Design an enzyme around this catalytic site. Structure first.
Site, PDB file in Angstrom:
ATOM      1  N   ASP A  19      -6.581 -24.082   8.937  1.00 55.60           N
ATOM      2  CA  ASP A  19      -5.793 -25.055   9.843  1.00 55.60           C
ATOM      3  C   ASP A  19      -6.833 -25.169  11.265  1.00 55.60           C
ATOM      4  O   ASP A  19      -7.498 -24.228  11.761  1.00 55.60           O
ATOM      5  CB  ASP A  19      -4.508 -24.914  10.050  1.00 55.60           C
ATOM      6  CG  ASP A  19      -4.055 -23.544   9.947  1.00 55.60           C
ATOM      7  OD1 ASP A  19      -4.624 -22.734  10.871  1.00 55.60           O
ATOM      8  OD2 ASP A  19      -3.125 -23.219   9.512  1.00 55.60           O
ATOM      9  N   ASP A  32       9.318 -19.624   9.777  1.00 53.46           N
ATOM     10  CA  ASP A  32       9.937 -20.884   8.831  1.00 53.46           C
ATOM     11  C   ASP A  32       9.629 -20.803   7.547  1.00 53.46           C
ATOM     12  O   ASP A  32       9.702 -21.554   6.852  1.00 53.46           O
ATOM     13  CB  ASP A  32       9.920 -21.943   9.515  1.00 53.46           C
ATOM     14  CG  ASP A  32       8.546 -22.826   9.855  1.00 53.46           C
ATOM     15  OD1 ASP A  32       7.704 -22.008   9.116  1.00 53.46           O
ATOM     16  OD2 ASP A  32       8.252 -23.786  10.395  1.00 53.46           O
ATOM     17  N   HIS A  74       6.227 -21.327   6.483  1.00 49.98           N
ATOM     18  CA  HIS A  74       5.018 -21.853   5.914  1.00 49.98           C
ATOM     19  C   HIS A  74       3.980 -21.156   5.615  1.00 49.98           C
ATOM     20  O   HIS A  74       3.755 -19.867   5.968  1.00 49.98           O
ATOM     21  CB  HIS A  74       4.661 -22.807   7.193  1.00 49.98           C
ATOM     22  CG  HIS A  74       3.989 -22.176   8.508  1.00 49.98           C
ATOM     23  ND1 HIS A  74       4.956 -22.387   9.779  1.00 49.98           N
ATOM     24  CD2 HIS A  74       3.308 -21.176   8.868  1.00 49.98           C
ATOM     25  CE1 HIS A  74       4.137 -21.828  10.695  1.00 49.98           C
ATOM     26  NE2 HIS A  74       3.174 -20.854   9.995  1.00 49.98           N
ATOM     27  N   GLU A 126       4.723 -26.802   6.902  1.00 50.73           N
ATOM     28  CA  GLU A 126       5.896 -26.814   7.341  1.00 50.73           C
ATOM     29  C   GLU A 126       7.109 -27.251   6.517  1.00 50.73           C
ATOM     30  O   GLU A 126       6.883 -27.820   5.516  1.00 50.73           O
ATOM     31  CB  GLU A 126       6.312 -27.504   8.633  1.00 50.73           C
ATOM     32  CG  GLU A 126       5.135 -27.187  10.138  1.00 50.73           C
ATOM     33  CD  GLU A 126       5.708 -25.869  10.550  1.00 50.73           C
ATOM     34  OE1 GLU A 126       6.367 -25.056   9.846  1.00 50.73           O
ATOM     35  OE2 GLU A 126       5.472 -25.380  11.909  1.00 50.73           O
TER      36      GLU A 126
HETATM   37  O1  LIG Z   1      -2.302 -20.872   8.785  1.00 51.43           O
HETATM   38  C1  LIG Z   1      -1.860 -19.904   9.751  1.00 51.43           C
HETATM   39  C2  LIG Z   1      -2.837 -19.669  10.876  1.00 51.43           C
HETATM   40  O2  LIG Z   1      -4.109 -20.010  10.212  1.00 51.43           O
HETATM   41  C3  LIG Z   1      -0.286 -19.885  10.036  1.00 51.43           C
HETATM   42  O3  LIG Z   1       0.300 -20.069   8.701  1.00 51.43           O
HETATM   43  C4  LIG Z   1      -0.186 -18.448  10.157  1.00 51.43           C
HETATM   44  O4  LIG Z   1      -0.462 -17.559   9.218  1.00 51.43           O
HETATM   45  C5  LIG Z   1       1.449 -18.124  10.568  1.00 51.43           C
HETATM   46  O5  LIG Z   1       1.798 -19.246  11.593  1.00 51.43           O
HETATM   47  C6  LIG Z   1       1.561 -16.717  11.291  1.00 51.43           C
HETATM   48  O6  LIG Z   1       1.096 -16.639  12.495  1.00 51.43           O
HETATM   49  P1  LIG Z   1       1.076 -15.120  13.175  1.00 51.43           P
HETATM   50  O7  LIG Z   1       2.475 -14.855  13.041  1.00 51.43           O
HETATM   51  O8  LIG Z   1       0.052 -14.278  12.156  1.00 51.43           O
HETATM   52  O9  LIG Z   1       0.500 -15.405  14.521  1.00 51.43           O
END
Ligand SMILES: O=C(CO)[C@@H](O)[C@H](O)[C@H](O)COP(=O)(O)O
Ligand SMILES: O=C(CO)[C@@H](O)[C@H](O)[C@H](O)COP(=O)(O)O
Ligand SMILES: O=C(CO)[C@@H](O)[C@H](O)[C@H](O)COP(=O)(O)O
Ligand SMILES: O=P(O)(O)OC[C@H]1O[C@@H](O)[C@H](O)[C@@H](O)[C@@H]1O
Ligand SMILES: O=P(O)(O)OC[C@H]1O[C@@H](O)[C@H](O)[C@@H](O)[C@@H]1O
Ligand SMILES: O=P(O)(O)OC[C@H]1O[C@@H](O)[C@H](O)[C@@H](O)[C@@H]1O
Lengths: 266, 266, 266
Positions: free
Chosen positions: C72, C141, C143, C148
């Site tokens: 992303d 959450d 994802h 989401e």
């Molecule tokens: O796609 C991604 C980032 O490229 C998100 O799915 C993160 O893996 C998730 O938000 C956890 O983020 P952290 O807890 O590792 O900061």
């Protein structure tokens, strides 16, 4: 998926009709490339049909090159009965728009070979490639089309046995007499529906609140076949406030904030 | 899916055997077009095997052009051990019917390359196109074949580690000694099973009641891999009254009414 | 699926890095046959990136013929902002390994046509056939990528609206100021991720415990899109002890016993 949380059933109908007209007009259908629209009966889509009729009268949409498929038809009920789904569709929609008779597709519930009729219907869908937009409702018990609880989530078109709950609900169209409601129906499958490019399910009234909870907050399961929309790349649920009663407050807030700019005009 | 609610395990076996004979005889198998039948071991299918043997003796079915695939085999257990699945199938079924040796397919749990043996097995299934009917049981823990909890729902044939629960259950075939039960098995996957044209799972006894609840009332999940049947276009569960103890009253009533005309003779 | 239950986040990073190097070195990538690696940003993968950098410096792995795709990118945030995902990947990984600039693939969140940019990205993945290994994290959450709650489980790459929960979590990278966190992101879909040959999700910290419970013990649903891993043939979750707090004791014991020989060195 998208969940469109509107206040009242009248707005659900206006939104659904506007969405159908948007898809048709952007598609630009022709005789050689028709727009293929799947349609439901029941009480929920009546406002949408009335809105589409008025938009056609106002010159905002033409159905000349729209091909339609309905979800289902009762077995054993005479086709000219006023509550057959064939009668419903002609009286409430087809007789009031510029659709072409050769472009209408309906299931025949009174042949001597239900399996052959269902296969004929599947083959006719495949002759157009894909359904571009399939509109439906939802049963009190979570069904889409008549894919009653414990239906295969990859089912095709077949005969199904209606639940008592469905027959009690639908008895309101037979003077409240459940003994007049057919026991079986021919219905497209969950797999048939998921093959459409886009699915739009209309949900109105507190009677549908458990079904909406299963669709939105529940997991994928064959008892509430509306939950299969979670597997689809382009599913839309359009609902009114009474249908949200079993959702969590945070769930309604989530979708209301997501769709705020798309509902402020309805 | 179909759920066939019968009273006793003896009736489950008669129903399953009648269903297998129906599929074979309507298929009309030949040397050039065999009927492909997937089979389980364990205690549940014994009554079905005995019924099929008697129907063959009575001239009601021939297995001359039936090709079989079994679900699994223990790893590390000698093939000539009386409780190997190879021994089970020959002693309880193959030695008593007119099946052809070249049409029997079994996993070998004692090669020096489990992955190559599992791929050989998948390739052999694909050489026949599809399995026409796959009969199975269900584990106490919800497994189909040996797809133990947390198996991929699109898994192929591979080695799997048996749960303690499975090994305790299966120890009844090893004089109650869990130390004699193998720890690993080669098993077809959930994806392998779902590729069959039709799946028939037999469920008997109160030990399976939580598994039947997960299959019928639960959602799709990898802890109870029997729940994957909800995704399949043609799944049948055949169960006895003790296995229904964890279902709701309305669930049993629903399927009993749906299948009333199909169970009144059993 | 595989669940790798390790004690601490440092071990999760070492395990993940070792697994990536194993896949690359067994694949033997070349200019004509590159290894295609999907990558996440966020705090979770930092230890893995640092470990991979050290293994490269030690001559244990080369990225010369590794092609990368990220999950992303933020919409509307300047690409040269230090917290853009482009900046994250170059500063924390690409600038420290022998990867080739032409083999790096990133989403551009600042074009005038998000849909065309997402389609360009999907088309670029398809130009390599498949992603061989996709590493990700998980949101509080549930994802995966930025799919989401209420995302389609067959979604492709598209713009998505970040939840307040996600933006609060990610505000720690913007001096704790949620008003600096972008509201939208371009993200690969759940379907895009499931197309990879292997998925490895890293999960560390008690903030992720509800997400891990949904992934491992919950059913397939669109509110916790990590639950879609249950559908995938080759999914691995690598977690630390704080992330297991919402699992049952028997669940942790199950996976700890299954993986005992594979974790005793970490
Ligand atoms: O796609 C991604 C980032 O490229 C998100 O799915 C993160 O893996 C998730 O938000 C956890 O983020 P952290 O807890 O590792 O900061
Ligand atoms: O397929 C249909 C009708 O073609 C059914 O699924 C209805 O959509 C559902 O039974 C709701 O009916 P109403 O509540 O709208 O009457
Ligand atoms: O694949 C099989 C055996 O081939 C297993 O899934 C059994 O069907 C299950 O363990 C039930 O075993 P029984 O209760 O019938 O002994
Ligand atoms: O698994 P499916 O195709 O949804 O259907 C299961 C059963 O559903 C019932 O409603 C039908 O009357 C039966 O004919 C059918 O076997
Ligand atoms: O995800 P799957 O293929 O069901 O399997 C996960 C694990 O299941 C275990 O039972 C196997 O012993 C492991 O080898 C395997 O990695
Ligand atoms: O069903 P999907 O593709 O996951 O997305 C549903 C909605 O998700 C939102 O986050 C997006 O901003 C919308 O554009 C989108 O319609």
């Amino acid at each position: 998926m998208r969940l469109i949380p509107l206040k009242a059933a009248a707005q659900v109908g206006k939104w659904a009709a506007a969405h159908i007209v948007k898809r048709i007009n952007e598609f630009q259908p022709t005789a050689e490339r028709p727009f293929v629209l799947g349609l439901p009966t029941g009480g929920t889509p009546l406002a949408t049909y009335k809105a589409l009729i008025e938009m056609h009268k106002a010159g905002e949409v033409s159905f000349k090159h729209v091909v339609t498929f309905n979800m289902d038809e009762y077995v054993g009920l005479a086709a000219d009965h006023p509550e057959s789904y064939r009668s419903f569709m002609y009286n409430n929609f087809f007789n009031h728009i510029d659709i072409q008779e050769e472009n209408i597709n309906l299931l025949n519930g009174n042949t001597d070979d239900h399996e052959a009729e269902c296969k004929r219907y599947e083959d006719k869908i495949k002759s157009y490639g894909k359904i571009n937009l399939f509109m439906g409702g939802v049963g009190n018990d979570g069904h889409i089309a008549f894919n009653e609880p414990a239906s295969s989530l990859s089912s095709r078109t077949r005969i199904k046995t209606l639940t008592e709950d469905t027959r009690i609900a639908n008895s309101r169209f037979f003077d409240g007499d459940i003994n007049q409601v057919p026991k079986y129906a021919l219905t497209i499958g969950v797999g048939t529906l998921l093959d459409a490019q886009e699915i739009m399910i209309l949900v109105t009234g507190h009677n549908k609140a458990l079904a909406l909870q299963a669709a939105v907050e529940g997991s994928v399961n064959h008892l509430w076949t509306v939950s299969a929309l979670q597997l689809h790349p382009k599913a839309v649920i359009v609902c009114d406030e009474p249908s949200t009663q079993e959702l969590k407050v945070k769930t309604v807030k989530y979708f209301t904030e997501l769709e705020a700019k798309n509902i402020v005009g309805f």
